[PDB]
Write a protein that binds this ligand. Structure first.
Ligand SMILES: Cc1cc2nc3c(=O)[nH]c(=O)nc-3n(C[C@H](O)[C@H](O)[C@H](O)COP(=O)(O)OP(=O)(O)OC[C@H]3O[C@@H](n4cnc5c(N)ncnc54)[C@H](O)[C@@H]3O)c2cc1C
Ligand SMILES: C[C@]12CCC(=O)C=C1CC[C@@H]1[C@@H]2CC[C@]2(C)C(=O)CC[C@@H]12
Length: 521
């Protein structure tokens, strides 16, 4: 993978083109880094491997954990840079304290620079922080790009990757404005283009970095069945995602879950940039870690992100509850993996009744029709729990017992076994009703359903070791000159934690910004 400049010269090759800043990828991080470089007058090229910008960032809800900024001040939030620092220190400990500090301390500058652009505006949207710890916001402190009329961004609207409910069925944007990740990437692209210093390319693939005397000076890029050599005078920012789509790297690293279960765009994030970085001496960390979530198994073997659980319960292959089904998706996923004994917890079984007329009582992204799950056998239905356990192969006495015990907890209003519905996260998706506890509803109105739940992800979070300025470090702690990484190309400062909504995009955006500031020196 690693190409030596002297070797290229020897073969008779030279630079196709030159820029100051070369950005690989086009999620929130990449485009934030692109904008930061180009807005202060550095010639910038962005390389997107696929025909659509945005990757998983486009799929996202575009909730962003950038605390203590002018956006939260407009909402009057009771929060601060120091309050957010306390929450991270309480969850993560002293491991990566310097990167924790740079994350919360730089959020305000990133947000102010971006909002100065007429294509970008954010607003606070309530979504709770995920753990009980000092500095938690029960309402959350995360911000979101405003809905975007695609007419405002010209030809860029047709180049944004569409939402999951359209993108895995050969479809483009559904009716209405661009929202969530579509609005984030549409606005960032329009900002990057407005600088007049950036080129935005699709179907341009990083293959290898180019090194001269141990310094990264550019990269080899495929585009139009041809090879190009792009020089980067100040540096290369690699924000091209993780290993989530590469089954071989995940099996080698011991990453739980599976490439086919990842909610990454199929084929996009195959660890190309992590590989390219290792090839020039970059150290790696946390490769067995990912941003986990439970997934509803699909007829085609893929998964759907299961979030905002509103009802049902979940059993292992023994027909027993083992977790709080309302847990934030990353803690849910880690509890599946911790409980899994040669396959008792992957798959798990979501059990629910006809309270939502056949629907599974959660948000599934994307949302496959019950009838297609039932025809494929991913879901099974029956008139009794007895017959449901027979069709699923679950122990019938244990499932019946599990459901009667859960139903007693819903009648009483407290789940003494797993404490479901006693957290602001659990309550956020459960509108207070006539029940003693809105997160606990009895499973008793037939027909009954079991859906197979697997260990999905929203990307992996392991990869190249970086400093507080996004510089890729070798095993000895020294910087690889000219090379930066951010987002899921870099090992997350968050370790084994998913602190709150928007940490993936927030960390990606801050370290892409800091990498561009470092290149501008
Ligand atoms: C339904 C859903 C909702 C989510 N909601 C949120 C949320 O609210 N908040 C949040 O913070 N996170 C959210 N996430 C997760 C979030 O989208 C990701 O964790 C994060 O955006 C990953 O960013 P990245 O830069 O690492 O990867 P990506 O955003 O995937 O960027 C990688 C890009 O680089 C391209 N690329 C890859 N290899 C190459 C190469 N060799 N050359 C050129 N280009 C290449 C890819 O095609 C892709 O376009 C959500 C995820 C899902 C599935
Ligand atoms: C849970 C989540 C993902 C990961 C992340 O980090 C931040 C959030 C909060 C916003 C959620 C989003 C998932 C998709 C959601 C449910 C929508 O369709 C509307 C709001 C949005």
């Amino acid at each position: 993978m690693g190409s030596s400049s002297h070797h290229h010269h020897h073969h008779g090759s030279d630079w196709t083109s030159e820029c100051d800043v070369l950005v690989v990828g086009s999620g929130g991080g990449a485009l934030t880094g692109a904008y930061t470089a180009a807005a202060q007058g550095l010639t910038t090229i962005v390389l997107e491997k696929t025909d659509r910008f945005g990757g998983t960032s486009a799929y996202s809800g575009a909730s962003i954990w950038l605390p203590g900024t002018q956006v939260q001040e407009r909402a009057g939030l009771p929060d601060s840079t120091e309050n957010a620092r306390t929450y991270l220190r309480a969850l993560l400990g002293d491991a990566e304290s310097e990167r924790q500090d740079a994350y919360v301390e730089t959020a305000p500058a990133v947000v102010a620079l971006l909002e100065q652009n007429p294509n970008i505006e954010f607003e606070f949207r309530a979504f709770p922080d995920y753990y009980k710890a000092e500095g938690r916001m029960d309402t959350g402190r995360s911000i979101n790009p405003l809905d975007l009329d695609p007419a405002d961004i010209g030809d860029l609207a047709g180049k944004v990757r569409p939402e999951l409910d359209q993108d895995r069925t050969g479809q483009d944007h559904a009716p209405g404005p661009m929202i969530g990740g579509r609005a984030l990437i549409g606005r960032l692209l329009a900002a990057v283009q407005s600088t007049g210093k950036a080129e935005l390319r699709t179907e341009s693939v990083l293959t290898s970095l180019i090194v001269e005397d141990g310094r990264v000076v550019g990269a080899e890029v495929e585009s139009g069945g041809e090879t190009q050599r792009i020089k980067a005078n100040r540096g290369v920012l690699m924000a091209a995602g993780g290993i989530e789509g590469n089954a071989e790297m995940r099996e080698q690293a011991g990453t739980p879950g599976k490439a086919i279960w990842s909610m990454g765009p199929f084929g996009a994030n195959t660890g190309d940039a992590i590989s390219a970085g290792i090839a020039v001496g970059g150290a790696t960390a946390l490769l067995d870690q990912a941003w986990f979530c439970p997934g509803v198994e699909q007829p085609d073997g893929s998964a759907a992100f299961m979030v905002g659980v509103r009802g049902g319960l979940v059993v292992d292959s023994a027909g027993e509850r083992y977790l709080n089904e309302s847990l934030p998706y990353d803690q849910f996923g880690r509890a599946m993996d911790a409980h899994d004994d040669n396959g008792s917890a992957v798959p798990s079984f979501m059990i629910f009744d006809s309270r939502e007329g056949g629907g599974l009582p959660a948000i599934c992204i994307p949302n496959t029709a019950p009838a297609k799950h039932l025809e494929a056998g991913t879901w099974v239905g029956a008139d009794t729990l007895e017959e449901l356990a027979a069709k699923t192969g679950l122990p019938a006495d244990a499932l019946r017992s599990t459901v009667e015990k859960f139903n007693d907890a819903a009648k009483l209003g407290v789940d003494e076994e797993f404490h479901r519905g006693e957290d602001p996260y659990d309550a956020f998706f459960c509108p207070p009703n006539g029940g003693a506890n809105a997160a606990l509803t009895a499973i008793e109105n037939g027909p009954f359903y079991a859906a197979r739940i697997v260990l999905s992800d929203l990307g992996t979070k392991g990869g190249l070791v970086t400093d507080v300025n996004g510089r890729v470090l070798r095993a000895d702690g020294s910087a690889i000159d000219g090379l930066y990484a951010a987002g899921n190309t870099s090992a997350s400062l968050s370790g084994r934690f998913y602190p709150g909504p928007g940490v993936p995009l927030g960390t990606a955006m801050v370290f892409s910004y800091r990498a561009a500031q470092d290149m501008a020196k």
